[PDB]
């Protein structure tokens, strides 16, 4: 299913996210998993693309939880 597709890609993305955000990795990975599979495969191939997506999700999350 698409859900297991995302979950499987999440399994590869999570440790890369956790290496820079060990506390928020679960939440940041889940946010990123909204993206389509082709984009997720791109993030797994390009560490600087994943990093920028992590930073974006960080800023979206902070705005959500602050103001």
């Amino acid at each position: 299913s698409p859900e297991e597709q995302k979950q499987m890609l999440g399994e590869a993305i999570y440790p890369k996210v956790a290496a820079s955000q060990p506390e928020l990795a679960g939440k940041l990975t889940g946010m990123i998993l909204e993206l389509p599979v082709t984009e997720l495969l791109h993030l797994l191939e390009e560490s600087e693309a994943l990093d920028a997506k992590v930073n974006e999700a960080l800023e979206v999350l902070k705005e959500y939880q602050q103001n």
Binding site: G10, Y14, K27, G30, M31, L35, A57, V60
Partner: peptide, 15 residues
């Protein structure tokens, strides 16, 4: 953004 702060926390599986 396209990212939602309402997204589910990702949980890894284990054996």
């Amino acid at each position: 953004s396209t990212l939602s702060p309402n997204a589910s926390v990702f949980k890894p599986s284990r054996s």
